[PDB]
């Protein structure tokens, strides 16, 4: 296998992280396990400290005219890498044990355990004119050297190896999304059934979505157009809970349903980024600068847990709405993310 | 007494600071951010001050009369109100931007666009011209007082005299309204900043530094501009009651804000490094082979 080894500007610190992307199981998040190769002769007085900080960048500026930092550490853990502390001792994994053998005694292992119910690696799409670091949650194992944690972290000794906490699709398929909204107009005084539904709940990125819109308009009023919008709701709860909506795919069909008539159409849509790159504030998946960033994967939150979680929590729902001579609307939620890569 | 050195000092300060800020924002691609272009219009507005306004103003003050030109007197005056109104509105715009960022950072990303910010400063320059140039072209600011009419008729005389209506209208639309928006926006920013620091709580030192930064940028602006528009409000009610030498002294205290804006609003490390360079890394992620089991 291979191990990603990012080195510090000076070159003394080199963190050997086995993988830059860690599968996110809602039941038990995987550990960020690695070893830091340092020279025992160098920094004889200081102590190598590694920290896995989940910095949520809400502003695209490291510093501004006011001096306020525009990055909040939602989850920051500090473990003493060298010298090994008896209290911080952890059972070395197969990856860590193999790395220490290859590197030798000069290398010291470090392990982390990301608590569950945390935001995944999501990046707010910066516009084409935007200049600066992309916003969103990003995990990074900053390996620095300092006598204490509160001491200024010199960038020459730091190792900012940004990683991504990606969440793939579950092995079990979800229930068929189904939602029906009936609106009764005062003048018409008759129901307007909109029994739209999806073929499946788990959709792979780039896979077409088939919305079986089944309209049964019994009211005298007729629908002029059928607008299906795949609204991406980013539940950002950093300071104040706010659901930011961004349409990633809109289909406005000029299909009219005469009064006292039924309708049934399977609209095929596909959430893609090629057209949504102009959209500002869109939540994209958190990937490395080299790898291409796709649409943010739907965060699978723990059932029966806190509804508010700091960071970006994207949720996709197709909004099948019919405009009438007010308008009817119904939201069918669905989870959009990649499947677990098969390994053997 | 000599006015060349006293006037040259401030002149060199404004032109030097602004040229340095403009050069740092242009040459350096990292500084070409969204919040920086707001300061580029402030520095651009402050540059025209030290280039055309401050030099002509200093001469008229110590010489005693305006001998450059008859129409140039009104042109220089209109350009002065334009730059001041633009500088004040720019300080209020960036303040609103910091509020939109600190309070609603996620909405500020999509709401505040580079092209939109360019339109914002363009509208700022437009409203300032409507308050400065439009009255000058129509001579609406000219007062009907006897001393005022005498000064206007005399080509040499160029004292800034305005009627009660225009004086109040300009004072409320140019300084007081942006002032109320600025003080209110900064108060909300300070409250929200403390809440963010409390939620997060090296940590307290940065908080105190940010809180101190906010205070100095607001105190320097107030202490410089408030006295000028404060005495002007009384001068409008009683022109003869207020003195001319004090009106000029406070007007220069207001120009000091534009003179200190480049060094006060660019104190961030990104701007300090660019200034040091004008006055004069991240290692790629590799990989190694792990012995297979």
């Amino acid at each position, epitope marked *: 296998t291979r191990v990603f080894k990012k080195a510090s500007p000076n070159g003394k610190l080199t963190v050997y992280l086995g993988k830059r992307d860690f599968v996110d199981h809602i039941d038990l998040v995987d550990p960020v396990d690695g070893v830091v190769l340092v020279d025992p002769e160098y920094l004889k007085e200081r102590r190598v400290y590694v920290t896995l900080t989940c910095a949520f960048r809400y502003g695209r500026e490291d510093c501004d005219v006011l001096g306020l930092t525009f990055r909040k550490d939602l989850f920051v853990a500090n473990v003493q890498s060298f010298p090994p502390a008896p209290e911080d001792k952890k059972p070395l994994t197969r990856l860590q044990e193999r790395l220490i053998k290859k590197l030798g005694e000069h290398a010291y292992p470090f392990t982390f355990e990301i608590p569950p119910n945390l935001p995944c690696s999501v990046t707010l799409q910066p516009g084409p004119e935007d200049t600066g670091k992309a916003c969103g949650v990003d995990y990074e194992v900053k390996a620095f050297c300092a006598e204490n944690l509160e001491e200024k972290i010199h960038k020459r000794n730091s190792v900012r190896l940004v990683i991504e906490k990606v969440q793939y699709a579950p092995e079990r398929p979800g229930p068929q999304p189904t939602a029906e909204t009936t609106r009764q107009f005062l003048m018409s005084d008759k129901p307007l059934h909109l029994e739209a539904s999806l073929d499946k709940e788990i959709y792979y990125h*780039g896979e077409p979505i088939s919305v079986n819109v089944h309209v049964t308009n019994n009211t005298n009023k007729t629908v002029k157009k059928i607008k299906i919008s795949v609204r991406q709701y980013a539940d950002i709860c950093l300071f104040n809970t706010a659901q930011y909506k961004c349409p990633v795919a809109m289909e406005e069909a000029d299909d009219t349903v005469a009064p006292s008539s039924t309708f049934c159409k399977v609209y095929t849509l*596909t959430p893609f980024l090629a057209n949504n790159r102009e959209k500002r504030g869109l939540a994209l998946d958190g990937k490395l600068k080299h790898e*291409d960033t796709n649409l943010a994967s739907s965060t699978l939150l723990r059932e029966g847990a806190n509804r508010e979680i700091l960071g970006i929590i994207v949720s996709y729902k197709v909004k099948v709405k019919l405009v009438v001579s007010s308008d009817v609307a119904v939201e069918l939620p669905f989870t959009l993310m990649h499947p677990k890569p098969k390994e053997e | 007494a000599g006015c060349s050195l006293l006037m040259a000092l401030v002149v060199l300060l404004i032109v030097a600071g602004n040229v340095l800020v403009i050069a740092a924002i242009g040459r350096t691609q990292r500084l070409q951010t969204l919040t920086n272009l707001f300061i580029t219009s402030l520095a651009c507005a402050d540059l025209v001050v030290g280039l055309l306004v401050v030099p002509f103003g200093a001469t008229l003050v110590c010489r005693g009369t305006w001998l450059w030109g008859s129409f140039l007197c009104e042109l220089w005056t209109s350009l002065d109100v334009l730059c001041v109104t633009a500088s004040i509105w720019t300080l209020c715009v960036i303040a609103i931007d910091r509020y939109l960022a600190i309070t609603s950072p996620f909405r500020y990303q999509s709401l505040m666009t580079r092209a939109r910010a360019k339109v914002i400063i363009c509208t700022v320059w437009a409203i300032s011209a409507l308050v400065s140039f439009l009255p000058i072209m129509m001579h609406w600011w000219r007062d009907e007082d006897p001393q005022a009419l005498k000064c206007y008729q005399d080509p040499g005389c160029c004292d800034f005299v305005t009627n009660r209506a225009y004086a109040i209208a300009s004072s409320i639309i140019s300084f007081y309204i942006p002032l109320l928006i600025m003080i209110f926006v900064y108060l909300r920013v300070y409250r929200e900043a403390k809440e963010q620091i409390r939620k997060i709580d090296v940590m307290a030192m940065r908080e105190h530094k940010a809180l101190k930064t906010l205070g100095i940028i607001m105190g320097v602006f107030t202490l410089c501009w408030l006295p000028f528009f404060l005495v002007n409000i009384v001068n409008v009610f009683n022109r003869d009651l207020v003195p001319k030498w004090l009106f000029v002294a406070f007007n220069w205290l207001g120009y000091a804000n534009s003179a200190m804006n480049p060094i006060i609003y660019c104190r961030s490390p990104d701007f300090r490094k660019a200034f040091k360079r004008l006055l004069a890394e991240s290692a790629t992620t590799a990989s190694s082979s792990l012995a297979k089991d």
Partner: antibody
Amino acid sequence: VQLVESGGGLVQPGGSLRLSCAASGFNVYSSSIHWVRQAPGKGLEWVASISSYYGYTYYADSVKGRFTISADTSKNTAYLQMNSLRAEDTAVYYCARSRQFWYSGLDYWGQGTLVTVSS
Amino acid sequence: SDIQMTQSPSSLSASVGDRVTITCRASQSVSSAVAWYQQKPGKAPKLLIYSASSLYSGVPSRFSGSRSGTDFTLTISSLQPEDFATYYCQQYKYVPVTFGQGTKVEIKR
């Protein structure tokens, strides 16, 4: 699961052609369509690729400019418009697919369409 | 620049039920993203191994991939009569992807 390409015929140098590639069993957004030409008695040479999910049009250094790759989403078809043809382009063009999330070789390959280029 | 993939041997001779090895060296330090394809005369190529270490679903298990830094290797434990075809190595890590020169494998007599 099946890629069928067509539109490859005899063309003279400097002519124009439109090579089509229809897909069946997979959409153009979830997988990027790639074009690789293999000249007779020579190895494979990547021509150009289209990523509908990203709208990225990648071309080879020697093939960039003269070629124009596009994709029709409604018909899940790929198109490779060819202009300023040269004798070197004589090869068996193959239309394959690559997993957009994420790139893992080229799973399915087309039968190929011999497009000879000679005066 | 273009990362040309030097593949060898240009022509490998082997017999049925024998072990063969095809080497492919990248000009630059390419990552594990190096696929291996099988091209038969006339027929279209076939993706044998992806990521240089993961066999594509539906291919025989005899094929195997092993990375030794920059010299990727495709090994066949026991090649059958159907395994007599050309082999190519492409580096889909950096664009433009560059294929290999080819390694024609024929029956040894």
